[PDB]
C-alpha cells in the first residue's frame, strides 16, 4: 500500500460510486533509499525500519 497502493473502499462523488485508492505520496517511494523511510508497528508498540 506504500509503493504499490491499494483499492480500499468505495465512495459517492456527485452521486457516482468511484474507487478509494491509498498509496504513498510520490517522493517517499521512488528511490531504493526511500525503503528506509517506512516502519512497522511491532507486536509491542515499536516501529521497525525496512
Amino acid at each position: 500500500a506504500a509503493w504499490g497502493g491499494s483499492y480500499v473502499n468505495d465512495f459517492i462523488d456527485r452521486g457516482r460510486v468511484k474507487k478509494v485508492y491509498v498509496m504513498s505520496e510520490a517522493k517517499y517511494r521512488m528511490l531504493p533509499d526511500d525503503i528506509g523511510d517506512w516502519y512497522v508497528r511491532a507486536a509491542d508498540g515499536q516501529m521497525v525500519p525496512f
Partner: protein
Amino acid sequence: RAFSQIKDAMVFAFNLPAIVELGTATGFDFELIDQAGLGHEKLTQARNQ
C-alpha cells in the same frame, strides 16, 4: 365507485388488457433523466416542475 369517495386510501379497480404488456394507445411512458452530477432533490424539483 365504491372505493373512491367512501374510503380512507386510494383504491382503483381495473381490468387487465388481453395483450398483457403493451401500450395504452393514447398514452406514453416518459423518463425524466438527470444528466449532470446532480442531486435527487434537484431531480424531484424538476419532476414536479
